[PDB]
Design an enzyme around this catalytic site. Structure first.
Site, mmCIF file in Angstrom:
data_model
loop_
_atom_site.group_PDB
_atom_site.id
_atom_site.type_symbol
_atom_site.label_atom_id
_atom_site.label_comp_id
_atom_site.label_asym_id
_atom_site.label_seq_id
_atom_site.Cartn_x
_atom_site.Cartn_y
_atom_site.Cartn_z
ATOM 1 N N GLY A 1 0.803 -1.207 0.000
ATOM 2 C CA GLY A 1 0.000 0.000 0.000
ATOM 3 C C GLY A 1 0.842 1.266 0.000
ATOM 4 N N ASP B 1 7.320 -13.106 4.807
ATOM 5 C CA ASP B 1 8.000 -12.260 3.846
ATOM 6 C C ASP B 1 9.266 -11.624 4.425
ATOM 7 O OD1 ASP B 1 8.011 -11.609 1.162
ATOM 8 O OD2 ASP B 1 7.184 -9.590 1.506
#
Ligand SMILES: Cc1cc(C2=NC(=O)N=C(c3ccccc3)C2)ccc1O
Length: 274
Positions: free
Chosen positions: A19, A136
């Protein structure tokens, strides 16, 4: 109380799959914050709050890891909006992304790489204690507090609740994904985390990732482009064992000979960052 009255919004820090993140300041205490916006449209990882309400997994995960151990960024607050979620996160100042730090400095000296690695080992271990799986781990998702020499794990947008059964979904970054994923689209959390940790260590001491393509990962041969110690090479090749059950546990990684005599963060800062 509204939202944009409580936080003095500032310039974009970055944007991508997570984002859009903006520099900010909490009006009142002038605390430095980071304001992260993500729209419901493109949220792939959804989770359920302790009290029912449906919510971006990241909020669920950061909530489960909020407290006194500052190896993972703190979620200070969050808001839902008609078409997006906004997150308020801590912001060390000054700060630098490990990716940019490594990009502008190249391969890190082992002593510094050791100090950093240890710190991300302590932070993943924390996440796992809280039932949180990052999924991640990589240089981009690690911030450096340049004053204290402390690392913060960030961006839990691809995470999941930790479990001992198999995972059949992966959102994280490919070149950081283990042979199990590529070949079978199945993995287990701890061993997959260890793999990505091996990729991270390599990246730290070599300046770049070890594998670019799927076939490189499946082969799992590690070639070293830079001069690296024998102990460090052995730890790296261990974390990158092709067979998952062959990979070391966190305790095993931290008891490894290369991992001995770590600098404290503040020493790290005085010798390597100041
Ligand atoms: C400075 C700061 C950054 C972030 C980021 N969160 C994130 O999800 N993703 C981020 C990111 C931005 C660009 C490139 C890679 C990751 C950064 C969170 C709290 C902070 O205080």
């Amino acid at each position: 109380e509204p939202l944009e009255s409580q936080y003095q919004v500032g310039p974009l820090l970055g944007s991508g799959g997570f984002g859009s993140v903006y520099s900010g300041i909490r009006v009142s205490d002038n605390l430095p914050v980071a304001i992260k916006h993500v729209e419901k449209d493109r949220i792939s990882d959804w989770g359920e709050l302790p009290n029912g309400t449906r919510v971006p997994m990241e909020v669920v995960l950061l909530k489960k890891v909020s407290s006194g151990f500052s190896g993972v960024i703190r979620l200070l607050d969050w808001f839902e909006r008609p078409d997006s979620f906004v997150l308020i996160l801590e912001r060390p100042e000054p700060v630098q992304d490990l990716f940019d730090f490594i990009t502008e400095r190249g391969a890190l000296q082992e002593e510094l790489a050791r100090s950093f690695f240890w710190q991300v080992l302590e932070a993943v271990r924390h996440c796992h204690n809280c039932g949180v799986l990052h999924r991640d781990i990589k240089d981009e998702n690690i911030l450096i507090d340049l004053n204290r020499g402390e690392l913060k794990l960030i961006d839990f947008g691809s995470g999941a609740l930790l479990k001992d059964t198999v995972y059949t979904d992966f959102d994280g970054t490919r070149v950081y994904s283990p042979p199990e994923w590529i070949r079978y689209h199945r993995y287990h959390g701890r061993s997959a985390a260890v793999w990505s940790l091996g990729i991270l260590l390599y990246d730290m001491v070599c300046g770049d990732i070890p594998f670019e393509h799927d076939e490189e990962i499946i082969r799992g041969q590690v070639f070293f482009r830079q001069r690296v110690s024998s102990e460090c090479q052995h730890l790296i090749r261990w974390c990158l064992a092709l067979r998952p059950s062959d990979r070391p546990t966190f305790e095993e990684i931290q008891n490894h000979p290369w991992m001995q005599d770590v600098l404290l963060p503040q020493e790290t800062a005085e010798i390597h960052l100041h």
